[PDB]
Design a protein around this nucleic acid. Structure first.
Ligand SMILES: *C(=O)[C@H](Cc1ccccc1)NC(=O)CCCCCN
Ligand SMILES: [Cl-]
Ligand SMILES: [Cl-]
Ligand SMILES: [K+]
Ligand SMILES: [Mg+2]
Ligand SMILES: [Mg+2]
Ligand SMILES: [Mg+2]
Ligand SMILES: [Mg+2]
Ligand SMILES: [Mg+2]
Ligand SMILES: [Mg+2]
Ligand SMILES: [Mg+2]
Ligand SMILES: [Mg+2]
Ligand SMILES: [Mg+2]
Ligand SMILES: [Mg+2]
Ligand SMILES: [Mg+2]
Ligand SMILES: [Mg+2]
Ligand SMILES: [Mg+2]
Ligand SMILES: [Mg+2]
Ligand SMILES: [Mg+2]
Ligand SMILES: [Mg+2]
Ligand SMILES: [Mg+2]
Ligand SMILES: [Mg+2]
Ligand SMILES: [Mg+2]
Ligand SMILES: [Mg+2]
Ligand SMILES: [Mg+2]
Ligand SMILES: [Mg+2]
Ligand SMILES: [Mg+2]
Ligand SMILES: [Mg+2]
Ligand SMILES: [Mg+2]
Ligand SMILES: [Mg+2]
Ligand SMILES: [Mg+2]
Ligand SMILES: [Mg+2]
Ligand SMILES: [Mg+2]
Ligand SMILES: [Mg+2]
Ligand SMILES: [Mg+2]
Ligand SMILES: [Mg+2]
Ligand code: NA
Ligand code: NA
Ligand code: NA
Ligand code: NA
Ligand code: NA
Ligand code: NA
Ligand code: NA
Ligand code: NA
Ligand code: NA
Ligand code: NA
Ligand code: NA
Ligand code: NA
Ligand code: NA
Ligand code: NA
Ligand code: NA
Ligand code: NA
Ligand code: NA
Ligand code: NA
Ligand code: NA
Ligand code: NA
Ligand code: NA
Ligand code: NA
Lengths: 337, 132, 53
RNA sequence: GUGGAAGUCUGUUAGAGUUGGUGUCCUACAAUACCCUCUCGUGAUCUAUGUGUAGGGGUGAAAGGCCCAUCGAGUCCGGCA
RNA sequence: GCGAAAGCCAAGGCCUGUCGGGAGCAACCAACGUUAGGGAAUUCGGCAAGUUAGUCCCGUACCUUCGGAAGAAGGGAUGCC
RNA sequence: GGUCUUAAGGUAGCGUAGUACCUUGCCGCAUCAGUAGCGGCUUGCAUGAAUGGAUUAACCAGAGCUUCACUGUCCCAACGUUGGGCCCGGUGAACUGUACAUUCCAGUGCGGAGUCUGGAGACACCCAGGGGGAAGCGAAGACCCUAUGGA
RNA sequence: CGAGUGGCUUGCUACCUCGAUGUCGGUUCCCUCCAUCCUGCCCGUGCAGAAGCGGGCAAGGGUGAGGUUGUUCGCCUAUUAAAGGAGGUCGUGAGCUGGGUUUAGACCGUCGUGAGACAGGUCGGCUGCUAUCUACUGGGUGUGUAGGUGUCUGACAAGAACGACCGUAUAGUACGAGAGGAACUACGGUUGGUGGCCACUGGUGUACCGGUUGUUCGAGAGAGCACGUGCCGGGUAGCCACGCCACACGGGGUAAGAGCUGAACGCAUCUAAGCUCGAAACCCACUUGGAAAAGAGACACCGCCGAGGUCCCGCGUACAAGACGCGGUCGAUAGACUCGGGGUGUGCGCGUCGAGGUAACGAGACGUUAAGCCCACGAGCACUAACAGACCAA
């Protein structure tokens, strides 16, 4: 009869090849509801510990009671919106129009970009407002970068640059809101965008595992019983039927596994602090000591320790925000032992 | 059903031999099926704490032997996680024979019971000697 | 809480509780303790144990 | 108690055999190999050397088995183009 | 140590079961170790693997050609000073 | 039927058999469930006495079944060890090759096409992989028929 | 009784292959069909309710575990929302298995004078090959677009990224004589699937530490071997699942169907023109890939005698080659050292005790000693090594 059974692995995350950018690139942004504001932030993964919380859920028979929750510590120092890029609507989608840069740059931004020595901010700004007058102005985003030098545990100094959308009230109002941020020095922080208790979508390039077989890469079985002793242990039965006489891309095969981008949805921000309160004794294995701006994300986050991760206000939340959860205990016990 | 209020790693399968924690006359029970459960190809149907499983009597009084009855899993060796993160495991695997209404077929329960089982089978709980 | 075996404080959100046959309960802070226990050893006789200390 | 029989038992003693793995090998190390497992191991036992039986003939506790990688009639040359 | 057994070591022989260098050395394959809870649900079939194990004491069923079955089964012991 | 063919007309036993077509026979044991196994029944398609019948202690790398024990056989896979594999120096074959050849979906054709027809797709070269196709390689099919073939 | 559709069964035919297209079943892995078993939306009912029966749309997803048998099929058990059927050379042996069929050995029954025969039964009875092309999964090198850095766009491509169930409130309510017994909606959980992650539990951990058997180095101390750890006990990091986190709603257009307005046909009519609704299906949303999209893209800045890049050196958030990423004295990139944080479980030696023994000797106990030994992690720290320097480039 041959019993039915779902195919092995999902066909929605391919091709399963190495990621082009180790720095994630969101392909969706939240909706323009509230007041103007940058729709994202970034940081570097450090490790995990647990925290005791007071059941915040109003529908839980346990609301108000203690509760152990797994948390991934992410160092989230301030970032800097170094420019405001403007897109225009055209018969072929959105296209960059112009950009408004500043003059105050982080000492080491030249490790990545050919920093601007001569730029005309106003002309850019003018071109943008004219575009808006004509009504061809497409969304507005800010060129942003991180300050790894601010994070000792992370070897790199070379900043990671990424573009983040600015969603706000009116286009005029948020256009202004953008320019304001940029003109200053672009210096902004996790506080300015997220509030502990809200849900965020975290993106990142997973931990790479080089080449791996089908069993691990796609979840196919291992040869069973006698078959596992004949000469085949971790190879699928066949590449397909006689006809069609070709191997279909849908059959599970070996290859690159890991080091892929992933946008993990609805991650609750348990807390946004600063200091060494979340650090573990002996130090986070293969990372270091935490003592500065940090964020505690509920559960796990894609990517390995030290990797850049990105935050974005949840684009499709299931639950309503339950702000500033009471944290009764944060474990600092050594992660060694 | 109702949330157990604890996470379980089923420590039993169809065919497993467990203890009958009561005085029905049935000593050993053999798991045959797990109420409301559907597995997946090649997967052995699994059962753990708080599940209502169909069972057959392997050992006990002649009249009880070979009978196919219903029961509830009261204890399992494989750990379970409670809301505060602590794991809880027992010395043996045991179940209590139950009827259509889920009232113990017996009069007394032998050995301890997991508190979580109460949030599901009241009459079974209200017949417990020790509830850990 | 305190480990019913070695005696050190059990880090919250950690450990296992073993329910005995008779109903008794035993909280363990780690595998190391549980295992030393299953070997039939008594914490008082193990010099590294806070109990013994 | 003595005695120490046995086509007797255990046994990778030596030695003989070859059940399963349908493993390794399968342009091999090898035109029958390797490893683990397994059988016998004082007897109708195993073995070296010498010696006898020759092709419709031998030899065969019989499988059409064996008679120099050749067997329901060896091999060589000839009949023969 | 029961031992021409294992394991270890002399005497004697050898580094010639004769290509090497490099990557924590990935997938996959050969041999193999360990795997929680369950415990043959696997499969034609428990195939493969595993369990048991030496010695002494206690104790030993059906059946039987009285020889045997039998190391039946089951229980206990086992070091060093 | 209450003898006739052709001499006799199946006795002791055994029996759904390593012999039973009907067949997974019927009843029972055993299991949640047992085309299996064992016991009883048994008209036996087509059992049966040295074509030996029945039965049988001991023995068995002989066939089937059950239990305890055991366990990665399985649930469901993981990590590890050693030799390969991968890169480098040196050594250095074979199989196979009408030609052309980057194919895919359909059609057509001696009715099972990389090469025909229509479309679709297609920048070149290279490394690793597991083997879908080349009705892949290997062997003038050992089955079947035919030959006024052979043994 | 009549008319058909399919090409799963069975039969017929002898077109194709006998210089061979490897058999049945199973397994594993992929795609598909709809004549729909469940799920969604509906119609009728001999539709009170509940539970059904029958029908329509509909192929998104699901359709599972076991006992006999080689079985396909089928019988049987317990679960279940349901445990649907079929095509892919009766998909799948250059993938596996080899139980059956279908070689040589043997037995039984039947048939034959006999050799020997019997889709009758039965025991035993082998599974070759280093991939040239093509195909696909992943990885590079070049050329084209025509100097560089960074950031984007989105033609198109993939997805099931989600399917389903149970429980509570609703409610012992509507309905009903009663027995019995719903729903909308809001909640909690489970199961299957999916992607990621290791604080927690768990596995490994031939790093490490301890115990101990045999033997060898005279004893002691400290060690080698016992298969690539002798065995036993514990186990860090990492990797992992048995562990943990996350995986909508809602819009738009439709099918069946329910209707509106409405004529042909003064009436009627959901349809002919127009319109309002309405499926787990379709489109969007969301995730992933994607400048080689030949209309071969956009923006900002830097640079064309110099911007940037390769080689080089120290290393990994990367890795089979290649690639990728970071650091390079204006430095914490790796090592040493010292702390911190961890694993073992209390070192050698000496002192006291020790059943005893004239004595020699003496297993072992306590103290010194949370000791000794060890660490794939972190910090401090320029002490050592990131030196020297080459090249390409409009
Ligand atoms: C019957 O189907 C025969 C049985 C057989 C014949 C000869 C020897 C032993 C058994 N089987 C075949 O004819 C198979 C043929 C294989 C052809 C493959 N190209
Ligand atoms: Cl398999
Ligand atoms: Cl079941
Ligand atoms: K043929
Ligand atoms: Mg094989
Ligand atoms: Mg740890
Ligand atoms: Mg199966
Ligand atoms: Mg711990
Ligand atoms: Mg003998
Ligand atoms: Mg012997
Ligand atoms: Mg001779
Ligand atoms: Mg013969
Ligand atoms: Mg196990
Ligand atoms: Mg079975
Ligand atoms: Mg099965
Ligand atoms: Mg065996
Ligand atoms: Mg019978
Ligand atoms: Mg006679
Ligand atoms: Mg063409
Ligand atoms: Mg021929
Ligand atoms: Mg013939
Ligand atoms: Mg003749
Ligand atoms: Mg072929
Ligand atoms: Mg239809
Ligand atoms: Mg489909
Ligand atoms: Mg086929
Ligand atoms: Mg099929
Ligand atoms: Mg094939
Ligand atoms: Mg083959
Ligand atoms: Mg091959
Ligand atoms: Mg066979
Ligand atoms: Mg057979
Ligand atoms: Mg025949
Ligand atoms: Mg056979
Ligand atoms: Mg050209
Ligand atoms: Mg060794
Ligand atoms: Na093989
Ligand atoms: Na093998
Ligand atoms: Na084939
Ligand atoms: Na005598
Ligand atoms: Na052999
Ligand atoms: Na002759
Ligand atoms: Na001649
Ligand atoms: Na040499
Ligand atoms: Na006769
Ligand atoms: Na014999
Ligand atoms: Na194993
Ligand atoms: Na192929
Ligand atoms: Na027809
Ligand atoms: Na041919
Ligand atoms: Na097959
Ligand atoms: Na469907
Ligand atoms: Na069956
Ligand atoms: Na075929
Ligand atoms: Na086959
Ligand atoms: Na084969
Ligand atoms: Na709709
Ligand atoms: Na281009």
């Amino acid at each position: 009869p041959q019993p039915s059974r779902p195919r092995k692995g999902s066909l929605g995350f391919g091709p399963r090849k190495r990621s082009t950018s180790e720095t994630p690139r969101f392909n969706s942004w939240p909706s323009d509801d509230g007041q103007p504001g940058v729709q994202g932030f970034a940081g570097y993964k450090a490790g995990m510990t647990h925290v005791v919380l007071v059941n915040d859920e109003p529908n839980s028979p346990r609301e108000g009671m203690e509760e152990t929750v797994p948390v991934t510590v992410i160092e989230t120092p301030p970032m800097r919106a170094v420019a405001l890029r403007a897109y225009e609507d055209t018969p072929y989608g959105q296209r960059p129009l112009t950009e408004v840069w500043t003059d105050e740059f982080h000492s080491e931004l030249d490790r990545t970009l050919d920093v601007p020595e001569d730029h005309d901010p106003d002309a850019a700004e003018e071109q943008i407002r004219d575009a808006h007058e004509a009504g061809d102005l497409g969304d507005l985003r800010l060129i942003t970068h991180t300050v790894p030098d601010a994070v000792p545990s992370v070897p790199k100094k070379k900043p990671d640059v990424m573009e983040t959308r600015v969603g706000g009230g009116s286009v005029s109002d948020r256009l202004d809101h953008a320019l304001d941020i940029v003109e200053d020095g672009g210096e902004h922080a996790m506080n300015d965008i997220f509030r502990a208790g809200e849900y965020a979508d975290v993106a990142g390039v997973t931990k790479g595992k080089g080449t791996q077989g089908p069993v691990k890469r796609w979840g196919v079985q291992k040869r069973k019983g006698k078959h596992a002793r004949q000469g085949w242990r971790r190879r699928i039965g066949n590449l397909g039927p006689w006809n069609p006489s070709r191997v279909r891309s849908t059959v599970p095969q070996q290859g690159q596994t890991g080091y892929h981008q992933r946008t993990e949805l609805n991650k609750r921000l348990i807390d946004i602090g600063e200091g060494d309160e979340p650090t573990v004794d002996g130090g986070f294995v293969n990372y270091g000591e935490v003592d500065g701006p940090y964020t505690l994300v509920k559960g796990s986050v894609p990517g390995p320790d030290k990797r850049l991760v990105r935050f974005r206000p949840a684009v499709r939340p299931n639950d309503q925000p339950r702000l500033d959860p009471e944290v009764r205990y944060v474990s600092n016990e050594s992660n060694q032992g | 059903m109702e949330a157990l209020g604890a996470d379980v790693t089923q420590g039993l399968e169809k065919g497993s031999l467990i203890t009958c924690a009561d005085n029905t006359g049935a000593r050993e029970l053999k798991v045959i099926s797990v109420h409301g459960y559907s597995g997946t190809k090649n997967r052995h149907p699994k059962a753990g704490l708080g599940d209502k499983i169909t069972v057959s009597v392997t050992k006990g009084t002649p009249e009880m032997r070979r009978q196919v009855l219903e029961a509830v899993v009261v204890r399992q060796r494989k750990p379970i996680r409670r809301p505060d993160g602590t794991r809880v495991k027992f010395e043996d695997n045991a179940a209590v024979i139950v009827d259509e209404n889920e009232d113990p077929r017996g009069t007394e329960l032998k050995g301890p019971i997991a508190r979580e089982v109460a949030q599901r089978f009241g009459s079974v709980a209200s017949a417990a000697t020790m509830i850990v | 809480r305190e480990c019913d075996y070695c005696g050190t404080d059990i880090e919250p959100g950690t450990g296992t509780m073993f329910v005995h046959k008779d109903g008794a309960t035993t909280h363990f802070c780690s595998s190391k303790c549980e295992n030393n226990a299953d070997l039939g050893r008594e914490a008082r006789n193990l010099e590294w144990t806070d109990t013994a200390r």
